[PDB]
Amino acid sequence: AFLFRGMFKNLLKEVRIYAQKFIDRGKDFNLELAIKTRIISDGLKYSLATGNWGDQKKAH
Amino acid sequence: RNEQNGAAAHVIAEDVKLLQFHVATMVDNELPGLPRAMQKSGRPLKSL
């Protein structure tokens, strides 16, 4: 749950960034291209595989 | 290149500041109070 909270936060941040970038030109976005499952899936896989309990950028 | 063009006299101060960081961190990466040199994947560089 400690990982999933931050990973859902990162998913929401990426969705917001993509949606804002797309609607700054005035067009309506699409949800499936906004959500990237790679963050949650690869982050959980990395944290379980390596044992470094956190983000990939902060191993120390 | 920026010395030939002349720049705006504060980009020169910015580049020399970043050149100061790059030269000194090659000699020593363990400077306190400064960001560590980063190439890749959360692993800091190994200085001399």
Added chain:
Amino acid sequence: ENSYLAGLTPTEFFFHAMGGREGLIDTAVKTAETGYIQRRLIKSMESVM
């Protein structure tokens, strides 16, 4: 109050484990400090002849 032949009673077993853990800890701990002391002494007096 019981010997090893009669068997330690479970409270005595737990207290004996508590006693032996201290010796295990001391054996694990003292090695690094002793090694550092030995290295410092040798590097101080290595060239005296």
Added chain:
Amino acid sequence: LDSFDEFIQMSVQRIVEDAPPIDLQPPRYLLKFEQIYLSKPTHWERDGAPSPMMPNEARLRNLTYSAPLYVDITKTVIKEGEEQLQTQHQKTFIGKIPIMLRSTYCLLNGLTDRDLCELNECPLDPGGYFIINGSEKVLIAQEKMATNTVYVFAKKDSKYAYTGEC
């Protein structure tokens, strides 16, 4: 097994519902996440056809024993027209969650010894681990200081004679 079961049953839904709704605008756009769905573990081939994946096949082919996660999102659009149109994207795929073996969401749940032997699984295997890229991984419990309680300590060389923390 109970820790992972409680995680999947309650904590994922609680984290999803706890996050604030997305407000972003020139036209007012609202995003809300309502309900999560977790399917049984499955594997998509290069053709894309989904098939159930056994833990033994995951071990042999160096796969990850994971299950897809689907969430329901409601999108209400406001373009300054005084009415709003709501659109729901039911079962939106958002990621893969690795599944602890022999839990309530594993494919080996509730199976008999004959079924376990037919699936080439040891009946005496306790489970409780993850298969990540074919390697069996176990999560070790970490001790931490208890929260929400008042403790009083005393330090040696600190300027404070007595300190209480919570």
Added chain:
DNA sequence: GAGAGCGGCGGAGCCAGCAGGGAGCTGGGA
């Protein structure tokens, strides 16, 4: 348009350093 290549994003123990506090001399007035 597909292929693609590069452009960008804890603890313990010696030194330096400053700050506060007296001797001591010097110009001003007795």
Added chain:
RNA sequence: AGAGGGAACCCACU
């Protein structure tokens, strides 16, 4: 006809 790398982390031995 001498191939053929490295860092990090974990476990274990005396």
Added chain:
DNA sequence: TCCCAGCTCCCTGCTGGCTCCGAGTGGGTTCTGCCGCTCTC
């Protein structure tokens, strides 16, 4: 000519910073950027 008040200067005490932390050895694992956008066939 000489008595004070004010400025000068050295020591003392305290705080912050830096470097160190046993010797060998056998296995295992993951990771070695990535999204993108102009560019080329």
